[model samples]
Target: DEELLAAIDMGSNSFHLAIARVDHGEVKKVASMSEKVQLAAGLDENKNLTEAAQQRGLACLARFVGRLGSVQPNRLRIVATNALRQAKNGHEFIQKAAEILPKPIEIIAGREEARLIYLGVSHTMANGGRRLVVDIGGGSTEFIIGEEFEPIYTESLQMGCVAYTKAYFADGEITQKAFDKAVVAARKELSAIATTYKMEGWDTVVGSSGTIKACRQIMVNMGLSDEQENVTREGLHKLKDKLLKFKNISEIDFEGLREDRRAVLPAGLAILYAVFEVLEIERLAYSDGALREGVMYDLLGRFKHEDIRDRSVQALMGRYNADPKQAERVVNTAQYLFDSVAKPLNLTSEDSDLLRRAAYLHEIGLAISHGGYHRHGAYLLQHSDIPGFSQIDQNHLSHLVAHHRRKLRNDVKNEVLKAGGHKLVYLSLLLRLAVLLNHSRSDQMLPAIELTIINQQWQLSVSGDAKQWPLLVADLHDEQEQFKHWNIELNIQSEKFID
Candidate 1:
């Protein structure tokens, strides 16, 4: 069986789109395209994306969508990296891109990018034992220690080729002093995570990304390394010595050097050299897999029912020692309510996942403190390195948990809910109701309940008698007032058991 999966990586220095088909349970590339957009280079002094860069990105997206053909929104995922993450006006740029491609773009967290890179490498390598993987992107470098398909540790640093170039080699000079300074700067960044990565160690070292690929090829083309195309310490140093002879980046005589890579070559070499020095890496073999590949593999997992997001949620729950029973009750009730309103509210199956995820994680903040635990949980969910969630997904989850039990504050409403519109508004209310109905935290059989929303009017009816549960009834009675803040008039009714 073959399933089409596509992924677009809006990287700092480049934009890449990959189309693959799951063939006999293996992802096979069908089409791929890349362009050097250098969005990171387009960042202004104010950390905002320049208009020129935004237009270039949108134009690329418009071209990419033409090749997308019939790939459904669910099958295609678009992820933005450090460039978009750093830009203050990324939302506006993304909004403009939405006009070309309607699917929501996922701005993945740094660690999540590492995890996906590991997934991509692990799947492509077909190897065993723990592996150390490094990817130097335009604005960041990601490191992951993984065994097979699972990452043991994933970290990302803000030191990358494009950024380093701007910092140390801004004048395009390739002097020893500038190169040494660049290496030191990168090593300084490595200092934070070097101890941890070194402690874990690895069986094999894999390098991925444009910089590594170009370096590996340069070594091969120059006969520095053998035909094996491995980046050896000896060969790397030799390459560095040869590079130092050049007065400027334009003077690099490396064979098979591409025009786009010319500018960042020095920065890339400096970063990789520092990595070798700091991590004691003797040799690195280039891997064909990278972020875009990792993204597609993750997408395939969704279709296979092996979602990493669920695992990420489970780990967070374990970390916080959340009440599983309560979470289950809330999850069940939330799903029930979600199913009831799926059609009328235009809720997709994917939206149900968001509601369920928020329900499971809603009370995690309580582990820290009972007082204002919701805000704590919201903060954690929003800021934590969730492996398989987008920034937008995290935002919705954070807001849902933030407002779950508390008064729907005007601050949050105007800033958050007003932006999310109907789906988020509906999900927040449903989660709140579920939490209220399960307040007792008991195994007692709860009354069957139903919710109806027509033309924004809200009604909740419960079987067996509302008077039997005075505490529960009072909670709903109080919630009606809170629901008013959400602009909902929650009309409550009781019905006799049909049986």
Candidate 2:
């Protein structure tokens, strides 16, 4: 049997999946599915994902599981978009999904969504110099400009077809006023970022998502535009006119329009109309690539030694102009401290890697005006697309960096402690000692620290370099603060290197 890779996109509006074989750098689609789970439609007034929505999403995933027989879990990627990202109960659904699916689902950010869309479109469409790709989904819209597979600008807009439909045309009445309001609202959302997109400019326009696909079909079926596969302004105008002419959504008959699309067609049209007017999109060549494709490419890139997370960390380091020499000092000291404590603490290389990466990036927030740099870095890590890092990974890194120096307050407790309290405490303690050891801001001496377990209590023994590096004597005093934070007993002694 041919080795195959599978991708699942748990979208807000639909749960879509594709299974393909990677043949000569091409993704040959062997099986594909798109189920209108309308997951976002089940969000209650409280913004919680309703149980029905969860069941709907899981049921669709169950079908995908059957289709993915004999496929290695490592060769598959399952991603959730805006719906799960925004859902307060997102982690809960993901837990359930993981129990049913082969692997854990990654809830990617919006900018990441744009990056994937570009990848998919660049591969599916003719290679070009530059192009703008837009995908209007149920809850969010993504905009990307790229050339030869590398995206220049990746952005996600707050307005989407389902969201707008909920805001403007939820009553199923197609009125000119309601349509105008939707268009205005969408444009208002675009107004903040439109200047950037327009100034950057593009040679061609491309689109993705069901909204764009449905719009193209409506245009083709109505004979209002050419028999091409993308949405044009003329086509959008015609679609709007047709939508407004009808009193009820059921009366609208456009070829290639899916039954699931009827509810959000008006809202979807509004967003596309706004894009045409605001960004002056004349003809957008819609492609099938978006978040899932990006996820797959990102996964593949990891195996190819081109991990985005590595780039993300380097980008953070450069952006902050962090003290690399000092970061190295802290990393070295932290590893020594970690190695000494690992046996008693039961911490492995996985934990050690995260701590070291956080050490390199802990000071990244200094770039964002540095009032509380640790706090700033934490914010960036918690929110931004650090490429290879998952949300939980980022969160842990953020919290560790945040607590590397300051008091472990309730906010820190809630953020990290609530998630994995014990590991958070251990990492927070390790980072604190590392940061404290490197506080001199210049080349300074660090003690030969030995860590081991004793009487069920983690023991850290620091022996000063008795003959040189006397400045470390002052550094040892600072470690007292870290010991207090972690409730670890510290023994300072004068001894030679025994290891």
Candidate 3:
């Protein structure tokens, strides 16, 4: 199958879609589209998204998905950054979005956003040193220090051109006072990371998206920067001088500026200008690579078995010194259980993949404290900056780990049922059973266990005499009580009688 791959970025200022198909080991761009959704500016005073803005984004999404005709659900990734992240009722919009598309959206964390921004930029480069990559998103900016494809340090700040415009330049005046205010605000945001970023060190700096891209073009048009399209200190100063001459946002026009690109320029320049001043940048080169491209590259890596999610899980496990042997035992048991029940339970390989990671990480909370370690594990997974995982992915993993060992919480069940449907519920159950079975942590191999599910009921038929495994018998008996909380049946039957 000539698998078609797609990446959709539901960004703050714009919504972008890139459709690619692998042609004999090459990812060829099949189609591309970008919509000026202005989602960041669409945020109302109360931090809620307006309906018109929602409509505009959905309309753009409709067009983008038109090119995604043959793409499989697994092949397409839909991610939202700051705009949706900041939206109070973003879930409402997400529900609206799901009506048109069935795939769940991954609202990525800022750190993950930075990592992906770096991923896009790193893959687009030929030569590499310790490089600094920055993405000027609409409601946020992402910064990364990376040696190769791997990021050394990453950060995302809650400051962007569109967001700043809504905050500072809403009056449309381009006075020096207003410009200075915006710059200082951005500088304040940059101050926290400047020392750390400078200390980490970078041989070169690159801006991958948004306002920087716009400014580079305008600078080139004004004959300040070279045709190679870079934003230099001298060019920026010259651009700033020319910008202050304009009295209002509407009158602010330049040779290369697009109509939709003008309003955000003043605010964007302030952010970039602050960046140069704070980061001590002389010249910043622009790159065609961005989050959408990064998503595509990461997507390609996923299918090739070089998945970053696995690395993220291992990193997480190592941080807490989780037992590799126990993890292995749980993963093996879970996989066996998953494989046996997956067909009957209508579970996908993706679900199995998620289960394996949970199995590896279920014990991470033991590092923090032995008691209620499941809660600790869940919190860590949910809050930590796990590379290659979206917020939604983390949430599901957290939910799974949260209930992996303990009694299932009523709230978590509702969340899992709503967010993941019966799929996650089954995955969580399988992990629990795997953990329960491997409680002894012995080297002895486990006997074959038959799992049969019918009409939302479960029957676990244990092989051999139950008397030999006294602890397991009692454990299953205790587990049956826990299962009652979830309103599920777990009938434990053995080949021989318990007596």
Candidate 4:
């Protein structure tokens, strides 16, 4: 059977599904589908997703589920963006969607979203000098400056077609005043990062997503540009003039316009025009690639041993000046204990990866201040804009780092951890034990040890140095109290006859 992978993007304005076959490490598109859900428009004043919106999203996902024929469960990645980030009740929505989809939905951060967008665009475009990739989604716009395959700068702004339309053009009125207001709003949002992006610079400008694709189509149909190949300043100006000629959005009609794209067209055009004016862009070609395609490539990378998460973790360690020797010690101990207990504890490769990465990052806060560095490290892990880490992945890593040392904290009872069904708690315990064993951070290797669980009690017994390592023995004794507080058992034993 051919190995197949699928990526589902739950976007603010639409839900997209991309299925591809992994052919010798390259992703060849097999099937794709999308539906305009307009999830952002469903947000209430309190940032809660309305029941109607949840139902709409679920229905769309149900259809997507039927289309995911025979793909391995582990090969599929489902991700949600902007709308879920804004919704206070996103977890609730996620729970509902989980029942219908083949994989759990991951809500990614904006910077991660930017990274994926660039990956998709870079793979699809022809070779060129550095380029600016602009992806205009329904609820947010991402601006990225990168050289071919590597993104040098990435940013996501809270301005998009559905959002801007609901805010400024809800009444569907198309007036000079309305258009001006939209431009100013977009420019204001862009102003914050415009200077930095300009400094980075790019030789070519490329636009990706439904909004840009629609604009390119409209320009081609209208014959606004002589080339009929890409979007140009002259063509955009002509289109804007034509758009304003209609008194209202409802009154406007364009050639080759899909019914589904009509409602968001004006707002989309408004954002595009603002981008062109703000960035002083002259020309930009459209690419079929976007978030979903980026995700497929990312998944492909994981299979090919070029995992971006590993790169991200290494980058983070370098940024914080982490102790490589200490990290190695902890990772070794963590992996050993993990291998010993993973099967009994029902842990997976993901759990082991989390344990390993957390081990590397646990002491990152020491660079800032030694005082309560564990807490500081937790804060950084939770809040940093790490590439390739979804919000959930970061939160999990944060918890492991935060609880790797100290009094366990209140996070042990976090709702997410509880939902994970004790696996996180067990991983944290394994990490704590690893850190405890490597407290001295010396080059000395750990004594051969066997770790086992009996009757809900963790038992650790060393094969040698029963009397030589009093400090190791004493540290294990100290860990007993910590485990007791969490209502768990930790038994430490060192005897020749017992061994």
Clash pairs (backbone) in predicted model 1: none
lDDT of 1 at 13: 82
Error of 4 at 10 (Å): 0.2
Global lDDT for candidate 3? Answer: 0.86
Colliding pairs, model 4 = none
Tens digits of per-residue lDDT, candidate 4, 1-499, equal: 2498888999998899999887774657899898978799899989899999999999999988888867887788999999999999999999888788878899998889999999899998967799999999988999999987889999999999888888778888888888889889999999999988988788999999889999899888888655738899889998999999998877777887887777788888988999998889999999888999899988888877788888989998999999999999999999989998887888989889999899999999998899889889989999999888898888888888877788754446565365455888888888999999889776775676656554568888766654445587778878888887676789877664121
Candidate 4 matches the true fold with a TM-score of 0.96
Cα RMSD to the true fold for all candidates = 2.0, 3.7, 1.6, 1.9
> Can you write out model 3's per-residue Cα lDDT over 122-204, one digit (the tens) per residue?
87885669888988888889999998888899999999888788878887889999999999999999998999898887898
How do these models rank on lDDT, best leading? 1, 3, 4, 2
Q: What's each prediction's TM-score?
A: 0.96, 0.85, 0.97, 0.96
Select the stronger candidate by lDDT from 1 and 2: 1
The C-alpha local distance difference test score for the whole of candidate 1 amounts to: 0.87
Residue 398 error, candidate 4, Å:
0.5
Candidate 3 ranges beyond 4 A from true positions: 409-411, 448-455, 465-468, 495-499
**lDDT (C-alpha, whole model) for all candidates:** 0.87, 0.78, 0.86, 0.86
